[PDB]
């Protein structure tokens, strides 16, 4: 896979969520300023739906929040009673931003993408994002 | 992006590292014992070399350690792709163990590979 290119315009379908995120969390989606020096935190967004996280991958992108493309979690051996769970990581500066991003994204998703779950994640000393 | 199949055999070229992991950290790579109830921790292994991570994706697999397939990290605005996988483990103790062991091997044979300790608050959304 290859990472998202910010310059690419959003499809119309995704514009609703993006606009909502810009209004609700304007500091995390402010097109101005410099990205944070370190991304010590992230929210893992997960869903059993294979395509719902595509929307999140495209919408949850700015200078202050960087999202991986959609991948999938590993299977728990050797259960057959399970399904594939898909996920992405939305990297942010600190836990404070992560809690905020989770809350805001889930609030939107609880109504329209209810299978989406969020998990606050933390790295030490921070995440190895290419510089 | 399809998850690792534990029922599938390992290609010969990966068997070496798997054997090394089995011998070095037997408690993480042994079929015996009880798998973790929660996976609270992970090691993210990252590298600009995707084929190397494909090796780690297949080799770093057991009932006690669960690695995602290889994906990639986003670019940091204001700039080559960096790839990653997550290896999920039980707690930070296992994560430190896994990181030291994998990086000891990679230090000589795959020097591009980096490891970062990752902690989920409160756990990773893996099934019970």
Residue numbers in the entry:
A (entry chain C): 130 to 260
B (entry chain D): 130 to 208, 212 to 260
Task: Please give me the paper's original passages concerning this structure.
The KSHV latency-associated nuclear antigen (kLANA) and the MHV68 mLANA (orf73) protein are required for latent viral replication and persistence. We solved the X-ray crystal structure of the C-terminal DNA binding domains (CTD) of kLANA and MHV-68 mLANA. The C-terminal domain (CTD) of LANA forms dimers, which bind two adjacent DNA sequences, the LANA binding sites (LBS1 & LBS2) in a single TR. Importantly, kLANA and mLANA CTD dimers undergo higher order oligomerization.
We also solved the crystal structure of a C-terminal fragment of MHV-68 LANA, mLANA(124–260), at a resolution of 2.14 Å, where a detailed structure was obtained for residues 130–260. It also is a native dimer, and the fold is very well conserved with kLANA. However, the structured CTDs of kLANA and mLANA share 28% sequence identity and the root-mean square deviation (r.m.s.d.) of the peptide backbone is only 2.2 Å. Between the two LANAs, the regions of highest structural conservation contain the entire β-barrel and the helices α2 and α3. The angles between two neighboring LANA dimers range from 0° for mLANA, 72° for the kLANA pentameric rings to 90° for the kLANA tetrameric ring. Opposite to the DNA binding site, both kLANA and mLANA CTD contain a characteristic lysine-rich positively charged surface patch, which appears to be a unique feature of γ2-herpesviral LANA proteins. We have previously shown that residues 228–231 (KKLK), which are located on the basic surface of mLANA, influence the interactions with BRD2 and BRD4, and affect mLANA-mediated transcriptional activation.
